Amino acid sequence: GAMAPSYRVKRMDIAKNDEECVVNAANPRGLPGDGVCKAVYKKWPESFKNSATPVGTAKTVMCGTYPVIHAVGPNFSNYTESEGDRELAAAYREVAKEVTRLGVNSVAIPLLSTGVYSGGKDRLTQSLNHLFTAMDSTDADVVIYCRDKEWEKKISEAIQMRT
């Protein structure tokens, strides 16, 4: 575990992370996709061998020795708000099980279901609060990746407000 487990946020491409493993915002079919998924496919294409997995689950595939945790959040265009909320919480719980199983001291993580799976809504708080619910009982250092300057500020505020 980390000596003093922490949360941090950085505004940059998760493909350039400085952590011991990465969480992909995957689709259920293991396809290259869009957004974070496409960046992950460019950097770690070997990790897409047999990565298909259902909504609400995570599946780890190694790229060399570097673990890629493919986490499938719901697409809110298809799910009801209630069922999508349940599956988004479930995907993060499965990320926490994998991070623990792998024994890593740090993990790079995007906010699941916030981009093209957001159903056109701002889901920063919903997705971040499910991340915290799952990861709070882990001892890995967690580094959240985002691309928007205003999101960086709001994620940073949410972290700092709990310390």
Least distance to Cl ion, CB of residue 4, Å: 27
Residue number with CB closer to Cl ion (15 or 102): 15
| Nearest-angstrom CA–CA distance, 32 and 133 | 28
Q: Which stretch binds Cl ion (CB under 5 A): 55-63, 85-93, 116-124, 129-137?
A: 116-124
| Nearest-angstrom CA–CA distance, 16 and 24 | 13
Q: Is residue 147 at the binding interface for Cl ion, with CB under 5 A as the rule?
A: yes
Q: Is residue 7 at the binding interface for Cl ion, with CB under 5 A as the rule?
A: no
| Nearest-angstrom CA–CA distance, 39 and 36 | 5
Q: Is residue 151 at the binding interface for Cl ion, with CB under 5 A as the rule?
A: yes
Q: Is residue 12 at the binding interface for Cl ion, with CB under 5 A as the rule?
A: yes
Q: Is residue 92 at the binding interface for Cl ion, with CB under 5 A as the rule?
A: no
Among 134, 140, 142, 146, binds Cl ion (CB under 5 A): 146
| Nearest-angstrom CA–CA distance, 76 and 119 | 5
Q: Where are the alpha helices (DSSP H) in 34-113?
A: 36-43, 81-102
| Nearest-angstrom CA–CA distance, 35 and 37 | 5
Q: Is residue 44 at the binding interface for Cl ion, with CB under 5 A as the rule?
A: no
Contact between residue 144 and residue 158 where contact means Cβ atoms under 8 Å apart: no
Residue number with CB closer to Cl ion (106 or 127): 127
Contact between residue 106 and residue 19 where contact means Cβ atoms under 8 Å apart: yes
- Residue numbers of the site for Cl ion (CB under 5 A)? 12-13, 115, 117, 146-148, 151
Binding-site positions for ADP-D-ribose read 13, 27, 35, 115-117
